[PDB]
Amino acid sequence: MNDSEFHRLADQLWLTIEERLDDWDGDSDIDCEINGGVLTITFENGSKIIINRQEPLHQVWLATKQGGYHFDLKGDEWICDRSGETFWDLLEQAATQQAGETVSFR
Numbered sequence: 001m002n003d004s005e006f007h008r009l010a011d012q013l014w015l016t017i018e019e020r021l022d023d024w025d026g027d028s029d030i031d032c033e034i035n036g037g038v039l040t041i042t043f044e045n046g047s048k049i050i051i052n053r054q055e056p057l058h059q060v061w062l063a064t065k066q067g068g069y070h071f072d073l074k075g076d077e078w079i080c081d082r083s084g085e086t087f088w089d090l091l092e093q094a095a096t097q098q099a100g101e102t103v104s105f106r
Helices: 003-022 087-099
Strands: 031-035 038-042 048-054 059-063 068-074 077-080
Touching: 003 031, 003 038, 003 048, 003 068, 048 087, 059 087, 068 087, 077 087
Parallel strands: none
Antiparallel strands: 031 038, 038 048, 048 059, 059 068, 068 077
């Protein structure tokens, strides 16, 4: 993947995450902040989910209370480079677990 393609895809992913988290209307209070380009989602129990870009590798990284996951773009989808699971499935699973409420953007 070229650098420009990564900027394009990551920018689009950032917008989608920001909009989805801003349009959150569930019962739980979920906060999303962008600092130094890094997205941090904070839940009521104090836990967090962090999303950042790894420019050199053209990857998006996810850190949750449970673990860490690195993603490559494959078939128009961000895929975990160890399990093949999608970024949205992993983010939603973690957010749901950490919020204690369904966090789905399907």
